Write a protein that binds this ligand. Structure first.
Ligand SMILES: OC[C@H]1O[C@H](O)[C@@H](O)[C@@H](O)[C@@H]1O
Ligand SMILES: OC[C@H]1O[C@H](O)[C@@H](O)[C@@H](O)[C@@H]1O
Ligand SMILES: OC[C@H]1O[C@H](O)[C@@H](O)[C@@H](O)[C@@H]1O
Ligand SMILES: OC[C@H]1O[C@H](O)[C@@H](O)[C@@H](O)[C@@H]1O
Ligand SMILES: [Zn+2]
Ligand SMILES: [Zn+2]
Ligand SMILES: [Zn+2]
Ligand SMILES: [Zn+2]
Ligand SMILES: [Zn+2]
Ligand SMILES: [Zn+2]
Ligand SMILES: [Zn+2]
Ligand SMILES: [Zn+2]
Ligand SMILES: [Zn+2]
Ligand SMILES: [Zn+2]
Ligand SMILES: [Zn+2]
Ligand SMILES: [Zn+2]
Ligand SMILES: [Zn+2]
Ligand SMILES: [Zn+2]
Ligand SMILES: [Zn+2]
Ligand SMILES: [Zn+2]
Ligand SMILES: [Zn+2]
Lengths: 302, 302, 302, 302
């Protein structure tokens, strides 16, 4: 088995109480590595996360925003006073969550969860895109259904866009001619009962192309809602086929700010990039902080 | 197949009309047996409990206080003219409810529900502690979320403090290194459909240590909001594991002042202590009075 | 140790398919003995009773009406083309159920359940009255709450009217000065676990005055929703006190048309009169037909 | 604990494109072992299943038929050109579903869900019978209510026909003297929260008589609508009494044609037979194909 190794025993991004939109939490962050820079797009919450109510209650409302941070070494990030993305329509009344960014041809696609807070199924995969990672346009509901953990493949298979999504509790794949209509939905990977990944699974960041397949980092949730990261390999030509899947996780809550926090016992990645023959996996921790762990790509064997 | 036996067919503590803070109800009492004396910390209400309005309304406002009473024989108590704990404004503006007190090493921890009355979900588990059952301090919100039916285990498990709580409608467990931050949340016990405990369950008093495990008295609520008491046995080394659970209740409303009162059909315990090879279980009755019922320790078997 | 004896092995009243309002069911009938005639006011349903849906569904809507029938011998009844009372639309959209008629000071009070059908709790005790059993008037919601199984006592107690009602699952008593406002609500009788009357109880017909107390026939419901009739005796001067209660039912489904029907396994009385020192107990059978059973006044011994 | 073992990693029956009535799905099959042959009566659909519309839409109409197939070995089946049961119009306009066939005293009773498609509650338990498995007659609505998952016991109990049915979400039992009118309704088994069988349960095929009880294979539905097979044992003399119930499933969606199909994540049995000390469990897979799994009888242990 292989596993990620943290670069810091402390977060690389933490909430800023002076900033309302990231007052309580910064986590679950998309990343792409473009101009020799790490472009990090992080979920941020103005509030703690009451989840145990029958419906989302306005008195316990939290608002998710996406922030931007940039770094050259992967560790130290420059941050900004304001978020780059917020919810603007009622379906995103409780904000925009867990972004995954994929570059296809020469455009960047950010897939996030729009949460409206009207009930606990009131969340949708949404998409905006940009030429430049700065000006997001063309907001759309990707699937009109309670769904999340969505990512696009960085290229087309047989001329089709590929979407990973997550009809509970499985990782699903779907295909599109036009990034509008999705078809040939199917389950590509399922939880394993009586294990750390028993309750549900979902893609982590967008799959990373390798020579032996597409690297599929994913999160698994156990019966007590611990989020841990696992890893699987998709067939290179047919990313609907899992060709390998590591039995044990590659990241689990270990440090205090991963075990303890707003949502205890969570590590969760929305983004990972290949940089200098290493995979940089940025992860939310306890839905409160962002850490980063790496693995030399040479060590990724199944 | 065992039951509690009421020590009296009359309440042992009743409201005092002359005391505003306990004019209408005394009930749901934490219990500690120290210095050959029963220490009762009882919920007290200045008012009946109108609960069927959309929001808590000032004209139906009730305020819970924690009063204190002490007894050598368990039946006759010395009472006090003012309560020993009242709610801070505004988070506990409608008062402090259902204390459970746990002695860990040489400190006493009182967990109770702070109710702010700003919404019907405006309640949370709070904690105060004392080394003497007299000077309570160090107030903190245990879980910042709508939650109640909370109690500490009387000792640490693998070096962690153990919290029992109640995200609706199950009995949960959680662990802490510092009595501030809780993690490893786990459901340990659930309602049982089509039984007296179908709607919801919650811990009673803190679990009593035995050689065969932890005695976990609890309350079950049926479809008609009748509150009864039941018993389970937790594993001694992992109290998250229920190793036995009696099907039948050990106490149910039977006497007129358990069936009739401010909230009909309630027996509810927030404390039970081992004295002279007997379990003394103090219980609110109809959210109006306090009774006491016992079981010979030898009769506790599953 | 005592039981009712069916007068007839035949329903004394059955639905009439050609009459929409009583096409499927005649049952749960109020009865008054006046002018040496049995005056039966029976619940009639246009439809079968689909009760297993999560909510009442318009497609399975049933409409209860109240018909009149009159007999001189209490066995053979004359009937009429049209109901005497109908649910006013929409507040009683699914009709008017289970009438209980009490005579007080030459006025007849009919208490019935108005059912709006908007959810399964959309029911309440309504009351009309008359001084001739023909011209019903004065409709009012007796208690603004989900409630049923209501009857008035046939005289005042210490100057106050007496209402029996049924906040689930118990028989309740309440008092009024004006037949509009009720106070001093109190449970007087409860189901008994692990018996034929375990799930709930409710009053049957209005209590019958005796020299030794108030005869309180009631229905009890077991864990499988079988309806049987029990009997208790209320203190003559304080009918809040049950002074006797028979362990075993006095009537239970035995005949095919009591065991089988629109609601299987039901006998249910809303009406019982004393005629020549016999109690004539009229009963719905399987919510489909009406039977009559009797017991000599002298054999009512507890 | 024990598990079924699939006889093939491929379906034993699959849709047949040139037969419209079974063009898209063959699944949920009744089975009878007579004349040393497996007689399979399988549900068949002319269409994919759109189930998430607000009402059953003509534009997505599917029609279920019952096809017949026969096999010597239980694996290789001869099939036929026409279905053997189709729905009456209009109450069964969307066809006849999920047959369970019980032999009682030289008569064969097929219980199925008749679905009329007029709304999503427009289904009911229907029954036909034959003495030859070929000439089905005596159509009747078994319970005139939204209900399904029905099967008859292969014997009477104290002279009574025994019906298993499923008022949501439990397995119910009921009894009849005439195969027309049903009474003594009783819940016998219920879903279990926070398990694979939390949402609802329903009988699989008719229970199989054993020396130690009736084998009740059933299906359990989790919170994500995954269908799995479980197994319980009913008391031999009193099959309303569950005397054992395995915690783990005996069969779960595992193969791709069980996980992906017209309805994902479904294994479902309507029939199982004992041949030569093995139970053959026929199961629909993803509401699309039919597989068959077995368990040696010796290994069936509670
Ligand atoms: O998407 C709504 C909600 O779903 C889950 O509860 C978590 O992923 C939350 O962080 C999220 O906000
Ligand atoms: O906790 C707030 C409120 O919760 C419930 O409604 C009851 O337990 C009340 O007694 C309590 O005051
Ligand atoms: O009152 C609503 C409804 O309640 C019960 O289900 C039965 O008594 C029905 O006959 C009645 O219509
Ligand atoms: O019963 C009607 C309809 O409802 C269910 O959800 C499914 O089993 C369908 O296959 C069936 O046709
Ligand atoms: Zn700033
Ligand atoms: Zn959106
Ligand atoms: Zn996820
Ligand atoms: Zn005083
Ligand atoms: Zn507090
Ligand atoms: Zn639960
Ligand atoms: Zn509780
Ligand atoms: Zn019981
Ligand atoms: Zn006529
Ligand atoms: Zn009315
Ligand atoms: Zn009733
Ligand atoms: Zn009998
Ligand atoms: Zn053909
Ligand atoms: Zn039919
Ligand atoms: Zn149920
Ligand atoms: Zn089912
Ligand atoms: Zn399992």
């Amino acid at each position: 088995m292989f596993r990620l190794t943290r670069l810091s025993n402390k977060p690389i991004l933490s909430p800023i109480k002076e900033h309302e939109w990231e007052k309580e939490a910064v986590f679950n962050a998309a990343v792409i590595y473009e101009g020799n820079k790490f472009h990090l797009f992080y979920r941020a919450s103005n509030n703690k996360f009451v989840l145990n109510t029958e419906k989302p209650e306005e008195k316990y409302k939290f608002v998710s925003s996406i922030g931007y941070a940039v770094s050259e070494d992967g560790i130290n990030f420059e941050r900004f006073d304001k978020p780059v993305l917020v919810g603007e329509i009622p379906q995103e009344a409780w904000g925009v969550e867990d972004p995954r960014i994929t570059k296809i041809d020469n455009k960047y696609y950010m897939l996030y969860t729009g949460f409206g807070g009207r009930d606990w199924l009131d969340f949708r995969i949404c998409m905006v895109w940009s030429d430049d990672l700065k000006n997001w346009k063309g907001h759309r509901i990707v699937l009109d259904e309670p769904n999340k953990d969505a990512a696009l493949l960085s290229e087309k298979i047989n001329g089709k866009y590929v979407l990973f999504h997550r009809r509970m509790p499985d990782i699903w794949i779907a295909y599109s001619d036009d990034l509008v209509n999705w078809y040939n939905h199917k389950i590509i990977m399922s939880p394993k009962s009586h294990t750390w990944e028993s309750k549900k699974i979902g893609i982590a960041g967008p799959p990373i192309k390798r020579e032996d397949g597409w690297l599929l980092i994913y999160h698994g949730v156990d019966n007590n809602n611990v989020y841990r990261l696992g890893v699987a390999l998709l067939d290179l030509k047919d990313p609907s086929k899992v060709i390998a899947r590591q039995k044990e996780p590659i990241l689990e809550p270990e440090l205090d700010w991963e075990i303890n926090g707003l949502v205890p016992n969570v590590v969760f990645s929305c983004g990972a990039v290949e940089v200098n023959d290493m995979y940089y996996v940025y992860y939310g921790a306890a839905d409160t902080h962002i850490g980063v762990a790496v693995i030399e790509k040479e060590k990724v064997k199944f």
